[PDB]
């Protein structure tokens, strides 16, 4: 349970939540990890929420997380990548600016965009996708390679 795999676990929980509703309680994601307390620990959890809020993918009360920007960012990733899967395109080169400009979230980092795409590629059930690979090629571009079971 390393620090950066805790961040993967939270970010994916927030993503799944953001398709159901645009809001959730601040600690509900921490609650769904620990059953599915030390003050030093959940400081780290709130330091991560602050870093995501610094990029405007979420905003924050003392009570709730607003995942509106996450919802519309992930909806574009669904739209974009489900389109490629149904045609069964072998590979695509993608500019990071494409996702920032479509969602108007220009402070989104490379790392965060790759994690959201990776999460979808692990999540989706529709299509014949069965393997994939992501290449962080450049400052402006990344590649995604697709593999399918049928033709």
């Amino acid at each position: 349970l390393s620090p950066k795999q805790m961040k993967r676990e939270i970010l994916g929980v927030l993503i799944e939540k953001s398709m159901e509703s645009k809001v959730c309680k601040i600690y509900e994601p921490l609650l769904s990890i620990n059953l599915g307390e030390p003050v030093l620990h959940l400081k780290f959890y709130e330091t991560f929420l602050a870093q995501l809020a610094e990029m405007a993918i979420i905003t924050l009360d003392s009570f709730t997380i607003n995942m509106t920007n996450l919802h519309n960012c992930y909806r574009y990733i669904i739209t974009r990548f489900q389109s490629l899967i149904n045609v069964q395109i072998p590979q695509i080169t993608i500019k990071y600016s494409e996702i920032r400009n479509f969602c108007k979230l220009p402070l989104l980092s490379k790392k965060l965009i790759l994690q959201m795409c990776k999460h979808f590629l692990n999540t989706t059930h529709i299509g014949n996708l069965i393997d994939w690979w992501v290449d962080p090629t450049s400052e402006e571009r990344y590649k995604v390679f697709f593999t399918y079971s049928k033709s």
């Binding site: 809001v23 309680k25 003050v39 959940l42 400081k43 009360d61 009570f63 709730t64 509106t68």
Partner: protein, 303 residues
């Protein structure tokens, strides 16, 4: 110049004079308390307009275009103004009060009255005497409510305080100070963020009130010199909202849990709601979105 926001400049133990006032309404009443909630002393509030003041709409704002005034003895006020069924019939007495304030204007006497919220001391207007008064020329308030009586109150009732609370969906709302909220005077319909320190937090039975103050002040042992600029009153009304706030349909809690979040600094998100004070007249209030006692209490023991 006597104004609804001028209590900071009022001298203690001096009587101030309201000429030709319209008593818009009062709290509690039939609309906010079905069944006759025993009207205790200090816990009856009236809302008074004077025609010097700006008329925006049937939604009025205390400390801007109307006076929030406390009644310190219900039976004296009712006797003085013309109510004849008190106290044998609590609800038939409010019927007579609605009649009198809907058809008459009054010359009112009020004073600065000191009262404590938690550990701080602040001021509020209190009614001393009321005197009957009666002139020709059309009433701008009655014109307003005759218009409302034809087109309906449905758009204002969407902002009733008892409706279930949820975000309007404002794209990236800006954090704002307490001064700016109190100057927010219209029914904007948008989410407002504010960071503030909790002064106190009362369970008034059918509603919870959270008194908020500027976050950078020493503890709570002091005097609030300008309650209009320095003190923000954020409210919660309705089964849905109170059940959600406490976590219980029974509004259950333990006494020391409310006073435990005193002093904590909270990031609230607020929306404008509305309290009905007469047949076609209202007052603006503020409510916190998805605020819960549990999350306050958790937030407190970390800080």
């Amino acid at each position: 110049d006597l104004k609804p926001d001028s209590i900071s400049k009022a001298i203690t133990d001096r009587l101030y004079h309201i000429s030709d006032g319209k008593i818009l309404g009062f709290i509690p009443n039939q609309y906010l308390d079905p069944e006759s909630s025993l009207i205790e002393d200090d816990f009856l509030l009236i809302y008074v307009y004077t025609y010097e003041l700006p008329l925006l709409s049937a939604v009025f704002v205390p400390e801007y275009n109307c006076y929030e005034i406390a009644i310190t003895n219900v039976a004296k006020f009712f006797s003085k103004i013309g109510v004849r069924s008190y106290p044998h019939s609590i609800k038939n007495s409010l019927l007579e009060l609605k009649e009198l304030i809907d058809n008459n204007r009054y010359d009112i006497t009020i004073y600065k009255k000191e009262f404590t919220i938690g550990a701080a001391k602040s001021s509020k207007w209190a009614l001393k005497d009321v005197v009957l008064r009666s002139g020709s020329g059309s009433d701008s308030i009655a014109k307003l409510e005759n218009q409302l009586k034809r087109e309906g109150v449905d758009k204002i009732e969407e902002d009733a305080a008892t409706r279930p609370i949820e975000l309007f969906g404002t794209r990236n709302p800006k954090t704002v100070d307490i001064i700016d909220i109190k100057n927010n005077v219209q029914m904007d319909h948008k989410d407002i963020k504010v960071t503030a320190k909790i002064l106190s937090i009362f369970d008034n039975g059918n509603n919870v009130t959270i008194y908020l103050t500027r976050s950078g002040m020493v503890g709570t042992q002091c005097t609030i010199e300008n309650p209009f600029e320095e003190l923000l009153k954020v409210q919660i009304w309705g089964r849905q909202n109170l059940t959600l706030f406490f976590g219980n349909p029974n509004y259950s809690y333990k006494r020391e849990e409310l006073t435990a979040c005193i002093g904590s600094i909270v990031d609230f998100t607020l929306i404008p709601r509305v309290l009905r004070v007469n047949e076609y007249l209202y007052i603006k209030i503020w409510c916190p979105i998805y605020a819960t006692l549990e999350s306050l209490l958790i937030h407190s023991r970390l800080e």
